[PDB]
Amino acid sequence: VKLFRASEPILSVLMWGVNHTINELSNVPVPVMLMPDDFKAYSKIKVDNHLFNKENLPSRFKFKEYCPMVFRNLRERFGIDDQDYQNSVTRSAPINTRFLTTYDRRFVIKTVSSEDVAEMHNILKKYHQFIVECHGNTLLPQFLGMYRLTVDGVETYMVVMRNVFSHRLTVHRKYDLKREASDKEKAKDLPTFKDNDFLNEGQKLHVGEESKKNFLEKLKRDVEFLAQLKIMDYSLLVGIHDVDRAERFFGPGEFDPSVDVYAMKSHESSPKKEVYFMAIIDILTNPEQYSKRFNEFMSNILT
Amino acid sequence: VKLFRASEPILSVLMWGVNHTINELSNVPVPVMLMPDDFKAYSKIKVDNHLFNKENLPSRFKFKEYCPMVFRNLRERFGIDDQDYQNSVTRSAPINTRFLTTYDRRFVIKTVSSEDVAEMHNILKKYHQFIVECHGNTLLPQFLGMYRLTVDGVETYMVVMRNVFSHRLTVHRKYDLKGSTVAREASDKEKAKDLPTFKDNDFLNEGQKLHVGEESKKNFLEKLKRDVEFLAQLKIMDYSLLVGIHDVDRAEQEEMEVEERAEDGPGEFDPSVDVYAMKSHESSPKKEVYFMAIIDILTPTVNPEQYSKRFNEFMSNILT
Ligand SMILES: Nc1ncnc2c1ncn2[C@@H]1O[C@H](COP(=O)(O)O)[C@@H](O)[C@H]1O
Ligand SMILES: Nc1ncnc2c1ncn2[C@@H]1O[C@H](COP(=O)(O)O)[C@@H](O)[C@H]1O
Ligand SMILES: Nc1ncnc2c1ncn2[C@@H]1O[C@H](COP(=O)(O)O)[C@@H](O)[C@H]1O
Numbered sequence A: 001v002k003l004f005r006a007s008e009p010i011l012s013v014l015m016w017g018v019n020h021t022i023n024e025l026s027n028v029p030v031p032v033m034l035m036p037d038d039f040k041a042y043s044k045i046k047v048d049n050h051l052f053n054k055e056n057l058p059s060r061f062k063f064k065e066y067c068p069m070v071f072r073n074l075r076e077r078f079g080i081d082d083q084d085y086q087n088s089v090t091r092s093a094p095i096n097t098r099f100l101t102t103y104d105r106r107f108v109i110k111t112v113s114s115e116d117v118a119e120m121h122n123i124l125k126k127y128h129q130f131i132v133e134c135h136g137n138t139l140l141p142q143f144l145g146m147y148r149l150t151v152d153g154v155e156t157y158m159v160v161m162r163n164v165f166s167h168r169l170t171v172h173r174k175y176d177l178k179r180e181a182s183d184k185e186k187a188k189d190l191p192t193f194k195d196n197d198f199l200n201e202g203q204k205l206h207v208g209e210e211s212k213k214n215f216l217e218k219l220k221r222d223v224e225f226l227a228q229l230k231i232m233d234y235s236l237l238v239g240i241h242d243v244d245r246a247e248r249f250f251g252p253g254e255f256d257p258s259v260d261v262y263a264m265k266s267h268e269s270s271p272k273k274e275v276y277f278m279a280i281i282d283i284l285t286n287p288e289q290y291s292k293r294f295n296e297f298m299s300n301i302l303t
Numbered sequence B: 001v002k003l004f005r006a007s008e009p010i011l012s013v014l015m016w017g018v019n020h021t022i023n024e025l026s027n028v029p030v031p032v033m034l035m036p037d038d039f040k041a042y043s044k045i046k047v048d049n050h051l052f053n054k055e056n057l058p059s060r061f062k063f064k065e066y067c068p069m070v071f072r073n074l075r076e077r078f079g080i081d082d083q084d085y086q087n088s089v090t091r092s093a094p095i096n097t098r099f100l101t102t103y104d105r106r107f108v109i110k111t112v113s114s115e116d117v118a119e120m121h122n123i124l125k126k127y128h129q130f131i132v133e134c135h136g137n138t139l140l141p142q143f144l145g146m147y148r149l150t151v152d153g154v155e156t157y158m159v160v161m162r163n164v165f166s167h168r169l170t171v172h173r174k175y176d177l178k179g180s181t182v183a184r185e186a187s188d189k190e191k192a193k194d195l196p197t198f199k200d201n202d203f204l205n206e207g208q209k210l211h212v213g214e215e216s217k218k219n220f221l222e223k224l225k226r227d228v229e230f231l232a233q234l235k236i237m238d239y240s241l242l243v244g245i246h247d248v249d250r251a252e253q254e255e256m257e258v259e260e261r262a263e264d265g266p267g268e269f270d271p272s273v274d275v276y277a278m279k280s281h282e283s284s285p286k287k288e289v290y291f292m293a294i295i296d297i298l299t300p301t302v303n304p305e306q307y308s309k310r311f312n313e314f315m316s317n318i319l320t
C-alpha cells in the first residue's frame, strides 16, 4: 500500500507519476528496436479527483512522460530494472524541490528548464546510439526518465539520473572540476571545491593502472562525443570517501560495484584508504578545445 | 502482461479503466466507515498517448468512476475480492456495448443511460444501507462498479453487476417475469432465437413450475418480499424476476457430445459464487438447477405499491 506521501504535492505527483507510468510500461511489449517515432512520443495523463484519494495527492494534476520507450531502453542498457527504479522513487518520498535523491540514494532528480528538455530531445537519438555503441560503459550522465508535472497550473520539468556517489558510502569532500570555492559555501557541511582548491590542496587519486587507463579510455570517448555534439561547460563530479573517519553488517570501503557504478578503490600502495567516485555531470544547461583541456586536467589527477 | 485487446476500442478502454482504478484503490486504505462525500465522489482520468502504446488502446480517451469508495465496499459486502474482479474484466475481453459478460461469466456489464446513472446516485445511500442490513443476501441486482467512458468524444455509461446465471452451468430455458393484467409473451421473432426470452403467459401456458422444496422456497420468498418492499419505498417499478433453468441430464449429454467432437459436479454449484442458484428437491420430475434474481431496477394504470404485491404474488406461485 503506497501512500504517495511527501513534503510537497509536487513530490507526491512525481511518485504517483513514476508509479503509474512504470506500471503502464509493464503492459507494453519490449520491442526488437526503437523506431524514430519513439523519439517524438509521450504519455500524458490528466487527473481530476472529486472528494477521493486526496489525502496526499492533489485532486487535479497532470503528468507527462517523454519518450517512454527510449528511457525504458536506457534503463535496461544502464543495468537498471524497471521495478527497482519504480521502488526507489515510490516507496518513500525523495529527499533533499530543485535537486533531490530517492530515499535509497540510488537515483537523483533534477528539476530542469523547458529549453533543457528541448536540448535533450535534440540529442536523444545520438545519446542513445552512443550508449548502445559503448555498451552502457560511460562516464556520461545516465538519463533514466524525463517528466513534466503540472500542479496548480504550473509546469515543472524533471530528469532522473543515476546518483554519481555511492548510495551507502558517505562522501567526505566533493570537487567540481572543468576557479575556486565561495566563502559562504566553504562553511557548509560538505563544501563544493573546484579546480584550484584541488590543485591547492595538492590532492591525489591513486588507482590501479587498470582503473586509470580504463577510466581514461572511456573519459576520452565520452568527451570526444560531447564535442562531436558541440556541448561544453560540464564538470567532473568527484567524490572522496575516507574509510577511517566513518570507522551482521556492511564492511569498511565495502560496496557493490554493480550498484555504485562509479566507485574506485585505492591502490595496494596508497597514502590514505579511500573510495573515489567520478562521472560527468551537467551537459545540458572551442568546445572541442574544452574537451582536450578537461581531458588533460583530469588525466593529471590519476596516478 | 495485459494488452487490453478487444474487438472494439470501447471494450479496451473498459478493461484499461477497471484495471487502472482497481490498482489505485489498492493504494487507498480501507476506511472504518463510508462518509456522505463518498456518495458524491468520483475519479476522472484523461489519457493522451502520442505515438505510444497504441496497439490496442486509442491514443486519447477518458475514464470516470462514480463513488469508487462505495462500490469497493459493495464488492466486499458481496464477498467479491477486488483482484478477482479486476482479473475477470481484464484478463480477456468481455463478450457480446450494450450488454457484455466477462470472459469467465462471473460478471455482467450493462450499458446504461445518463438518467440511469442519476437514479443510481439518488438511490445509492439507501441501497448500500439495505445491503448492509440484509448482509448481502438479496435477489436485487448487485452493483459492483459504475463508469463513464469517453472514446472519440463519445460518452458511454456502464454499470457492472453480478451475473444472475451460473458461471459454469448452462442455461437451457429462461424467463422475464413481471406479472400484470396485460399481455406478455414471446414474439414469433424471439422464439426463433436459440435462447428465447419467454415471458409470463408462456410460463403459464406451458404450465411450468420450479421444484425447490419448502426450506428454499421460504428462504427465497422472504428475500423477495423484503427486496420488493425496499424497491416499493424507493418508488421503483417495472423490474422483472430473471429466471434461468439448467437441465442437469441435458447438460451431461451435451458435455459428452462436446468430447466426442473434440477427440475426433453433476448439477453442483458453489452457492458462494453462483449466488442466485437453487437445486431442485428430491421429488422433482426432471433434475434441475434454477437461477432467479430481480433485474431492471433503473429506467431502460399501475403503481409502485401495487407492483410490489402483484410481482410478489406471481413469483410466489412459481415455486413448489
Ligand atoms: N518530441 C519533442 N521534440 C522536440 N522538442 C520537444 C519535444 N517535446 C517537447 N519539446 C520541447 O521541450 C520543451 C517543453 O515542451 P512541452 O512538453 O510542450 O512542455 C519545449 O521547448 C518543446 O518544444
Ligand atoms: N549525478 C549526481 N549525483 C549526485 N549529486 C549530484 C549529481 N549532479 C549534481 N549533484 C549535486 O547537486 C548539486 C546541484 O548540481 P549542479 O546544479 O549541477 O551544480 C551540486 O552541488 C552537486 O553536488
Ligand atoms: N453525484 C451525483 N448526484 C446525482 N446525480 C449525478 C451525480 N453525478 C452525476 N449525476 C448525474 O448522472 C448523469 C451523468 O453524469 P455526468 O455525465 O457524470 O456528469 C447526469 O444526469 C448527472 O446529473
Ligand SMILES: Nc1ncnc2c1ncn2[C@@H]1O[C@H](COP(=O)(O)O)[C@@H](O)[C@H]1O
Pocket: B099, B108, B161, B162, B163, B164, B165, B176, B197, B242, B295, B296
Ligand atoms: N444481471 C444479469 N445477469 C444475466 N443476464 C442478464 C442480467 N441482466 C439482464 N440480463 C439479460 O441481458 C439481456 C438484457 O437485459 P435488460 O437490459 O434487462 O433487458 C436480457 O437477455 C436479460 O435477460
